[PDB]
Design a protein around this ligand. Structure first.
Ligand code: HEM
Ligand SMILES: COc1cccc(OC)c1O
Length: 402
């Protein structure tokens, strides 16, 4: 497309370090645009992302690097009967009435345990010391991975992240960094070595762990889902479900720190924490551009006539800065009027764990502010955000008196 020739010079590193300038141009010039280094059409505005994610003429497809990382059948990448089965598999523990039965007793003691290690230090790096540990320890226990240390869960989601977002392609559409999948493969090998004996045990001795229920739920007597059938969705969990609540917590904190007067409001009135988190997710969406759909027939989107079989990456993080919806979206604003956002996606492949994730982030922030009410950010340190597929702050140094 001739007038978008500047897109030929957009690099993967540029999109990873800060995609917002390129995507501001995309939202104005071409809400649906083919980005050469990603090898795909990308949807950048709220209208186009929502349309593609809910269209009867699109279905789920995994991004190329995500498919290389997860294989088949990843819940995010399949449709029809297989997707219906995988959704029925994961949904029980995520049902709101079910989450409300045990979420407090799950997350609150975990939050306190990680806080107790540093709440009197006067300094902390909250991404590694708090946000990621609470996120992974909560989900890990729910899944049945109690004996997998939070360091290991965090390492796995970091390697899966880099593998599943290893999207750069060369002139011929081939992956430009083929060695970047190796640490994904390696993480998967480690995961198998840990999880295979757990599955062996759960097949014979089911328990209340989520993965045990994934094996057994809805199955004829004496049968379990084959482990090869559920492992790709285990990997989906061990990337985004492990990573995103921690990133959403951390981005919300960075946003609040940028508005000191709003941090103070929320600490004074913790009933504002859900609103603070909702704005945090819009402001820096944890899942920024990690999923996609594929057209199933010829379809016209944003004036582009797409053939059948055309993938479209859903850059929800860009859609959540759509100035057709938001005023000054690059600024964190607790007092933004509550509007729909796309940080959980849309359509039949929208996030299945919204209610759980919101509670994990809420409880974690409640306990943090109770333990450290005079929390401040360490302004001697910069906060850098990283990621195009998944985005969040790489560190969050804080300080407090005493
Ligand atoms: C703040 C934290 C989270 C955010 C921002 C988030 C966001 C998202 C997004 C954007 C998608 C893709 C939706 C689309 O393509 O339209 C997704 C899919 C999904 N998420 Fe969440 N997620 C979070 C946490 C979680 C957690 C903790 C779990 C599990 C306990 C979870 C389970 C899933 C599943 C199973 C899918 C795939 C749904 C499908 O393809 O049918 N998510 N999430
Ligand atoms: C590409 O990987 C993912 C995309 C969307 C959601 C995920 O975990 C919930 C996830 O792991």
């Amino acid at each position: 497309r001739p007038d978008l020739a500047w897109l030929d010079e957009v690099t993967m590193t540029q999109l990873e370090r800060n995609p917002y300038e390129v995507y501001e141009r995309l939202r104005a010039e071409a809400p649906l645009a083919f980005v050469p280094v990603l090898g795909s059409y990308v949807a950048s505005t709220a209208e186009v992302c929502r349309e593609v994610a809910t269209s009867p003429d699109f279905e789920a497809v995994i991004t190329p690097a995500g498919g290389r990382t997860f294989g088949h059948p990843a819940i995010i990448g399949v449709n029809g009967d297989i997707h219906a089965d995988l959704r029925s598999m994961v949904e029980p523990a995520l049902q709101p009435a079910e989450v409300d039965r045990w979420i407090d007793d799950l997350v609150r003691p975990i939050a306190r345990r990680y806080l107790e290690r540093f709440e009197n230090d006067g300094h902390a790096e909250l991404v590694a010391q708090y946000c990621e540990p609470v996120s992974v320890r909560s989900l890990g226990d729910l899944l049945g991975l109690q004996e997998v240390d939070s360091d290991k869960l965090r390492e796995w989601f970091a390697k899966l992240n880099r593998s599943a977002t290893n999207a750069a392609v060369d002139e011929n559409g081939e992956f430009a960094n083929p060695e970047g999948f190796a640490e994904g493969d390696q993480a998967k090998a480690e995961i198998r070595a840990v999880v295979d004996p757990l599955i062996d045990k759960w097949i014979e001795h089911p328990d209340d762990s989520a993965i045990s229920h994934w094996l057994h739920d809805g199955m004829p007597p004496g049968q379990t889902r084959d482990r090869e059938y559920i492992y790709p969705t285990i990997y989906v969990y061990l990337l985004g479900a492990m990573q995103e609540p921690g990133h959403g917590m951390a981005s919300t904190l960075v946003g609040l720190f940028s508005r000191p007067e709003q941090l103070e409001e929320v600490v004074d009135d913790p009933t504002l924490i859900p609103r603070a988190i909702a704005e945090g997710l819009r402001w820096t969406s944890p899942i920024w551009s990690a999923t996609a759909r594929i057209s199933t027939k010829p379809v016209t989107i944003a004036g582009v006539d797409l053939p059948a079989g055309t993938p479209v990456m859903l850059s929800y993080g860009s859609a959540n800065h759509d100035t057709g919806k938001y005023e000054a979206p690059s600024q964190y604003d607790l007092h933004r009027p509550p509007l729909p956002h796309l940080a959980f996606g849309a359509g039949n492949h929208a996030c299945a764990g919204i209610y759980f994730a919101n509670h994990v982030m809420r409880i974690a922030l409640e306990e943090l502010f109770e333990a450290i009410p005079n929390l401040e950010r360490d302004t001697r340190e910069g906060v850098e955000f990283w990621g195009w597929g998944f985005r969040g702050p790489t560190s969050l140094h804080v300080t407090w008196e005493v």
